[PDB]
Amino acid sequence: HEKVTIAPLVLLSALDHYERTQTKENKRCVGVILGDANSSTIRVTNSFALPFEEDEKNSDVWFLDHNYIENMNEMCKKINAKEKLIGWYHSGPKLRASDLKINELFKKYTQNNPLLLIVDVKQQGVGLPTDAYVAIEQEKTFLHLPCTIEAEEAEEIGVEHLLRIRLTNQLKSLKGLQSKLKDVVEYLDKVIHTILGKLQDVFNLNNLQKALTVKTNDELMVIYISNLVRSIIAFDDLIENKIQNKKIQEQRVKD
């Protein structure tokens, strides 16, 4: 599959618009992304904002500015001519049912499949909660793609200036287990379709991990053997330094 990369310039741009647009009472701020989707790795080097207002009790009322789309063409094209509109982004933690109708408005300006980017403004997740989706023909479905961080001279300089293993993964595995656990509890309470089909894929593919235990410990002892021959070398860098430090002490006594 393809890849999606979001620069920290786009990250901080979407996260700052929360307090800039006075977004509260669980609302969203619809932006726009600028990148090159022609390659296999989608990289967004520019982003902007758009005014968005939606009623809480009415999902059929939403405001969008299509005039600002033509305003960035008179600006960005005079600086970077390789910037095009590959889609938009949202500041909400989870998508709603209105995103299906938003794709009809941007399909004329975008020259390719629009990209759906979701950025969590609450920062309540672990790692990179920012996710991306690609709308294709199912009627329509959203194909998720992994999100990475852009590494370039135009970003890491500003990141290092403002700012300056398994234990982290343990908290990440709990998020995947509790997500499926709470989904079953909410399902049984509201009743007594794609999740039920893919749910048993994990159960039939951790009692099954105990059959290879005989072959698992075969390569585990090699790790300790590699550490045993390395442990002897560890003393070679120590005792040798003790001999050198002893010769330094003999010169300090004569002083």
Partner: protein, 51 residues
């Protein structure tokens, strides 16, 4: 069999042939044994000039 052209084993009691040939594994014995012989000569030069 002894010429190591094809590794195998016979059975002269019942007149049969069993399985013999098996591959090796590196970074375990041959690689570690050659390191023990080298480290043994290096440590001999440590305490020699240390006293």
């Amino acid at each position: 069999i002894l010429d190591k052209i094809f590794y195998g084993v016979l059975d002269q009691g019942n007149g049969w042939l069993y399985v013999y040939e098996t591959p090796n594994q590196d970074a375990t014995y041959d690689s570690a044994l050659e390191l023990v012989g080298q480290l043994n000569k290096v440590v001999d030069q440590l305490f020699e000039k240390a006293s």
